[PDB]
Design a protein around this ligand. Sequence first.
Ligand SMILES: Nc1ncnc2c1ncn2[C@@H]1O[C@H](COP(=O)(O)OC(O)C2=CCCN([C@@H]3O[C@H](COP(=O)(O)OP(=O)(O)OC[C@H]4O[C@@H](n5cnc6c(N)ncnc65)[C@H](O)[C@@H]4O)[C@@H](O)[C@H]3O)C2)[C@@H](O)[C@H]1O
Ligand SMILES: Nc1ncnc2c1ncn2[C@@H]1O[C@H](COP(=O)(O)O[C@@H](O)C2=CCCN([C@@H]3O[C@H](COP(=O)(O)OP(=O)(O)OC[C@H]4O[C@@H](n5cnc6c(N)ncnc65)[C@H](O)[C@@H]4O)[C@@H](O)[C@H]3O)C2)[C@@H](O)[C@H]1O
Ligand SMILES: [Mg+2]
Ligand SMILES: [Mg+2]
Ligand SMILES: [Mg+2]
Ligand SMILES: [Mg+2]
Ligand SMILES: [Mg+2]
Lengths: 271, 271
Amino acid sequence: SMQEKIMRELHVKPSIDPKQEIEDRVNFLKQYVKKTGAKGFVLGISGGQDSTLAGRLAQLAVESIREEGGDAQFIAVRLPHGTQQDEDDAQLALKFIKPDKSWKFDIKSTVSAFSDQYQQETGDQLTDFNKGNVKARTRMIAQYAIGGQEGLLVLGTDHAAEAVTGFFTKYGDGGADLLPLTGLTKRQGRTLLKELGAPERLYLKEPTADLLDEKPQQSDETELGISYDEIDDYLEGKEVSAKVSEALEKRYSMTEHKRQVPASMFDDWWK
Amino acid sequence: SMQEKIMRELHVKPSIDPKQEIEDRVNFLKQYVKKTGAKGFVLGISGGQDSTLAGRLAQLAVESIREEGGDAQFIAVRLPHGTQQDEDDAQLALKFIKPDKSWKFDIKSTVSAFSDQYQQETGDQLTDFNKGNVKARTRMIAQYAIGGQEGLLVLGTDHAAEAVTGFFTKYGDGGADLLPLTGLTKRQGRTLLKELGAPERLYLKEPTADLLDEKPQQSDETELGISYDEIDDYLEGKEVSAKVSEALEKRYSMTEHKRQVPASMFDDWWK
Ligand SMILES: Nc1ncnc2c1ncn2[C@@H]1O[C@H](COP(=O)(O)OC(O)C2=CCCN([C@@H]3O[C@H](COP(=O)(O)OP(=O)(O)OC[C@H]4O[C@@H](n5cnc6c(N)ncnc65)[C@H](O)[C@@H]4O)[C@@H](O)[C@H]3O)C2)[C@@H](O)[C@H]1O
Ligand SMILES: Nc1ncnc2c1ncn2[C@@H]1O[C@H](COP(=O)(O)O[C@@H](O)C2=CCCN([C@@H]3O[C@H](COP(=O)(O)OP(=O)(O)OC[C@H]4O[C@@H](n5cnc6c(N)ncnc65)[C@H](O)[C@@H]4O)[C@@H](O)[C@H]3O)C2)[C@@H](O)[C@H]1O
Ligand SMILES: [Mg+2]
Ligand SMILES: [Mg+2]
Ligand SMILES: [Mg+2]
Ligand SMILES: [Mg+2]
Ligand SMILES: [Mg+2]
């Protein structure tokens, strides 16, 4: 079925061993640093589940490298746009991750400069939606600037429950160097956080991209019209209602471009 | 040999028919955009060879779509950082391209806001090299904002002679939706642009990324330490010095991450 195909392509298991998943994903981070001579990692810590998980895995990886006599560091970075309404949760995430370094970059003045220039040049105010994608891409710029200045790789938090819907900004939070969470469903990420001892508030809250000025903290499920339990059931190979398979297979097909390098005439996937 | 592998991976031909390259690449643009249902294309026009070529191909594609009774448009956009020293060549490129629409977005206030915030937040001056990548990524943001507002796809200008060296900013000018120039060597692209009727001032224009404040208009060759005709010889399967081949093969491996989606543990290309 298409469901089986999507599961295979997104690397999803129906059942996991959380300890082994953690080992595999920390080992990946370590191996990628060994092979490339990298100095460590940078990651935006939002106060949401995914960045909490990826941040703790990163911290464990750099600690393990150092325990082996090597050199590595992790910079966690707060990236509010002005006042972030769930700053408290982001601080709690930092308290749990216990990163080597905890930095901050408020993206609002950059986003405002851009938005104001856009109207000055075109006569048009950006739509809230398009401004939201400017925010996500500005966060990419901020992380790549810290990584470039400090000699580090940019982690991304994409996982299977965002990949299937294409629920990320292309060259925004989609723009990263390496991905410790690939293949995990949303529920599976919660299981890994539990194994790691995370505070439950960080995985009980609603997932949100929090990109819109007019609809702040909008839940992903509100935007998508599909819940993470539906997504996860699909991705874990459960026998789900036909409405879920219809919705997800359409979104997956429509967003393939986000999961491929830019298309050329030599590629066949898009035809 | 590794040369054969790279030539194949980058879709390079040893010999081309310039007129049919033009036909094929225009047709790619037509076929792709129609598949997506997008209204057309946006592209940053720097004055340089690659964007002049890709821009003219785009304009031909949209004109062909309209000739067959469809709807399509091309927005060419100037993206200076303040005063661009070779603005005159960019204006000449626009004159040659004859784009449907001609827009401008000056990135300087955005880049200055970012840079000033970086120093405020970190206590660290953003360095010229890292600021240059901020400029390239701000250009990406600008093109995606126009594209999102106007319903267009973002063209990229990557070609084999930049691809092999990774001579583009990751998620800057590398960030695009589709690539009409894939597989062309530098001199092959020049042949297309000449066949399209461009003046020598455009098709023999010295390549530059022009990203640095301390070294404006630096030529690519100054930065790379190798010239485009050596790169082109390698890519086209000619004999080159051990000097050239060792250097290009090492750089190709070191920059594979720029030619792949973000790495996960399920990928092996980095090993
Ligand atoms: N004024 C304009 N007006 C309108 N439009 C335009 C203008 N200017 C440009 N345009 C448009 O843009 C295109 C492109 O123009 P073009 O061809 O002239 O530009 C160019 O030539 C051009 C464009 C931009 C840049 N360049 C060069 O690239 C290098 C960047 O590498 P780099 O400086 O080192 O920076 P990077 O961020 O790309 O890569 C390093 C980062 O990568 C990650 N990393 C590293 N190793 C690694 C790994 N092993 N695994 C995983 N990740 C890893 C880390 O995060 C790390 O920090 C450095 O050498 C630069 O000088 C070139 C044109 O065709 C136009 O369309
Ligand atoms: N406050 C913070 N502090 C610190 N760190 C962070 C913060 N916030 C986030 N972070 C960090 O970021 C990550 C991610 O966080 P996360 O998981 O909560 O965010 C999120 O959930 C999140 C983040 C960003 C976005 N979302 C959603 O994606 C959609 C994007 O619109 P979209 O319309 O899908 O926009 P797009 O540009 O991504 O895609 C459209 C463009 O694609 C092109 N195109 C289209 N068709 C097509 C084709 N067939 N072929 C080729 N190209 C094609 C065209 O150019 C077209 O314009 C839209 O629905 C958005 O709401 C979600 C976190 O984990 C953190 O690491
Ligand atoms: Mg997320
Ligand atoms: Mg979130
Ligand atoms: Mg170029
Ligand atoms: Mg300092
Ligand atoms: Mg140039």
